[PDB]
Design brief:
The structure is a homodimer. Chain A is an alpha+beta fold. Chain A has a single domain, classed as DD-peptidase/beta-lactamase superfamily (Beta-lactamase), CATH 3.40.710.10. The first copy, chain A, has nine helices and nine strands. In chain A, the strands form three sheets. In chain A, strands 2-1-9-8-7 form a five-stranded antiparallel beta sheet, with helices on both faces. In chain A, a hairpin with a 4-residue loop joins strand 1 and strand 2. In chain A, helix 2 runs antiparallel to helix 4. Chain A is globular, with a radius of gyration of 17 Å. The relative contact order of chain A is 0.19. The structure holds chloride ion (4 copies) and magnesium ion (4 copies). One chloride ion binds next to strand 7 of chain B. Chain B: It comes from Pseudomonas aeruginosa. Chain B: It is an enzyme of class 3 (hydrolase). Chain B: Keywords: Antibiotic resistance, Hydrolase, Signal. Chain B: GO terms for molecular function: beta-lactamase activity. Chain B: It catalyses: a beta-lactam + H2O = a substituted beta-amino acid.
Chain lengths: 265, 267
């Protein structure tokens, strides 16, 4: 505990960074943390709960995975690599939007889903319905990434998001079908190979969602399953303005690698 | 014909490249071509017909999109971004493998599917069944990318692949359901934003499969639909050993830009 904390502190000082981390068990209990209850910007980590909300509306018969979400170039965003590919067709399905939002972090895809669930206020409501008293969305993409110090819009804490993610992935509020879909989608994430996953062994099942924002923000939340079958969530939130991008990912990987050491013990 | 062909020759000479190209209409008829009947290595363009073969088996009730294809690290390849993510779980579904092979060009995923259809011989048989007398697969990933001059293993022609792709996308061999799935997967391809698509307007629906190989090989085949609702396929095969990677993609985009200029006139 003492050791894990001093290790993260050393990483802060070496990198002139701020790091928040929570490692939780299947049931949401804190195993190890550092600044676990400090507020950070979600950045794109919000897309994981967003996808769960959409899945919960499918579960409730309020949404259909093949429903066409019609849009045109007016709905594009600067970072929207899938939506730009599909725009000439005039739509993406709910399914395609979920996959794009999760595995590519597509901002237009995420905005399409936000539109269909009732916008950031309804994602906040969703967080509260899960027992997450902290996490909140307020803005749509891309303005939710400003990461201004002291601004509580669009924020979580490492503990809260770790506990929310553990509930979604290992808990039972989603149907078994949706829970399975979410897990396989996260495992297939394309943006997290240099982040938490780079600090975990390849033999562990891992799924994650990254975030990147202004003021040097770089985040990742992952679930993983060890070879002994034990289940965890690791949230890692960082602000590292003095680091270059590859160095920001290495910092998260470094955190994961320290977590790996604790899990093994 | 003349203007188009001279534009491509110009590109060859400017880039010390070899380029083959076929632009075909919906029904496979050649609109414009340059070296359209010369052989080139398919490289990863083969993964488009591979996916169609798998969908044809689904259509026939011989395959199931949710079937788990079990594998372990012994199945991984050097370029296998998706399969490496899923390997701890022990499998990928047929659907996951199709999506990964198409949109990422994942080599392990393609090899998983090849195993389930009977391997390169049966993909070649599928080509034949479609009326493509030329295209052939002989090796699995990654050795199929050697692109050695005069080696006919793992080769097609720009016209053969254009016609095969137009049959698969716009013809009757796949069910409506499977045709739509294939199309939407190709439209979401993640590796073609700087190749054919970069030369076509944003308003045209485009879906594509790229290929990259040794000896400067860089390929792309795409279907597109203009705003008038006319349907085409464009296949572009290039060997450009003297260019850097980004320049190889720009060469393909430049070909597609010439095809665009032509299609607009035709319309
Ligand atoms: Cl983009
Ligand atoms: Cl499919
Ligand atoms: Cl590639
Ligand atoms: Cl490729
Ligand atoms: Mg399928
Ligand atoms: Mg590649
Ligand atoms: Mg490739
Ligand atoms: Mg290229």
């Amino acid at each position: 505990q003492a050791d894990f904390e001093h290790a993260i502190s050393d990483l802060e000082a070496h990198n002139q960074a701020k790091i928040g981390v929570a490692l939780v068990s299947e049931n949401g209990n804190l195993i190890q943390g550092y600044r676990a209850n400090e507020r950070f910007a979600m950045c794109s980590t919000f897309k994981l709960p967003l996808a769960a909300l959409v899945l919960s509306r499918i579960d409730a018969g309020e949404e259909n995975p093949e429903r066409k979400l019609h849009y045109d170039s007016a709905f594009l965003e600067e970072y929207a690599p899938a939506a730009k590919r599909y725009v000439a067709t005039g739509y993406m399905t709910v399914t395609e939007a979920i996959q794009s939002a999760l595995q590519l972090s597509d901002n237009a895809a995420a905005n399409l889903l936000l539109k269909e669930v009732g916008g950031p206020p309804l994602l906040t409501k969703y967080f509260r319905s899960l027992g997450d008293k902290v996490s909140r969305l307020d803005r749509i993409e891309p303005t939710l990434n400003t990461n201004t110090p002291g601004d509580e819009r669009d924020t979580t804490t490492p503990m809260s998001m770790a506990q929310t993610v553990s509930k979604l992935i290992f808990g039972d509020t989603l149907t078994y079908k949706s829970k399975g879909q979410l897990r396989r989608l996260l495992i297939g994430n394309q943006t997290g190979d240099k982040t938490i996953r780079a600090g975990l062994p390849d033999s562990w099942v891992t799924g994650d969602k990254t975030g990147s924002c202004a003021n040097g923000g770089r985040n990742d939340v992952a679930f993983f399953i060890t070879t002994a079958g034990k289940k965890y969530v690791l949230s890692v939130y960082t602000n590292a303005p003095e680091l270059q991008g590859e160095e920001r990912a290495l910092l998260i990987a470094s955190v994961a690698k320290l977590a790996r050491q604790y899990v093994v013990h």
